[PDB]
């Protein structure tokens, strides 16, 4: 079957440049139109652009939000698809998918020359975050139990870290029943923050791991 592996992306400050790559195998890459689609955090899909075959001129067409800033290119000899991103802005952050596109000719005579067009095969996606923030490990604060009772609830506040992700376990993975680790939120400071809570009977250590800064913190939550 068709296989698409993506690479590139990562962290870049606004105004910087970045190149995404997509290597294809399992189909006739040279005979395919390809493209890119992105999704910002908390938003829906947005088409970025497409590129035709080399015999079609290798013409790149782009969505309005990225036109004159992004360019697509292809290397048929290596089955590589590229997305060149320059003058990046914060609103360009998100997950970028490379797509193998396909068309179907319209047969109604009045529309001969037109085609249905769709993204037939999607890559796994590559993350792009446009931010000025530097690597920073998270501050881990306890959410102590208190008359947080019903069954009591405790947790830990993992605050002010960049970039994502953060991993959180309780009692070195022993405690998993009743655990809720919330998705991270981007604070107005440009740093991320999340909480991890757990409900336990009234009658405790959270293990925070932030690989980007290689930070390991173990916090006892004492009422």
């Amino acid at each position: 079957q068709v296989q698409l592996v993506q690479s590139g992306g990562g962290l870049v400050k606004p105004g910087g440049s970045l190149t995404l790559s997509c290597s294809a195998s399992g189909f006739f890459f040279d005979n395919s139109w390809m493209g890119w689609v992105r999704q910002a955090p908390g938003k829906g899909l947005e088409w970025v652009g497409r590129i035709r075959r080399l015999k079609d001129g290798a013409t790149g067409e782009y969505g309005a939000a990225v036109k004159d800033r992004f360019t697509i290119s292809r290397d048929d000899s290596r089955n590589m698809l590229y997305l060149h991103m320059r003058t990046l802005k914060t609103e360009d952050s998100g997950t970028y998918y490379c797509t193998m596109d396909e068309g179907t000719p319209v047969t109604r005579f009045l529309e001969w020359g037109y085609f249905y067009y769709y993204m037939a095969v999607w890559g796994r996606g590559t993350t792009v975050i446009v931010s000025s923030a530097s690597t920073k490990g998270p501050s881990v604060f306890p959410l102590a139990p208190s008359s947080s009772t019903s069954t009591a609830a405790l947790g830990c506040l993992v605050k002010d870290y960049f970039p994502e992700p953060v991993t959180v376990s309780w009692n070195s993975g022993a405690l998993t029943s009743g655990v809720h680790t919330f998705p991270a939120v981007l604070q107005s400071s440009g740093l991320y923050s999340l909480s991890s809570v757990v409900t336990v009977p009234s009658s405790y250590i959270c293990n925070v791991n932030h690989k980007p800064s290689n930070t390991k913190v173990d916090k006892r939550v004492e009422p």
Partner: peptide, 19 residues
């Protein structure tokens, strides 16, 4: 080496229709 796909059809139908 020769490449045929949907776009070759549509350009063929376009060429016919417009000429």
């Amino acid at each position: 080496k020769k490449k045929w796909n949907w776009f070759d059809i549509t350009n063929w139908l376009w060429y016919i229709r417009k000429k």
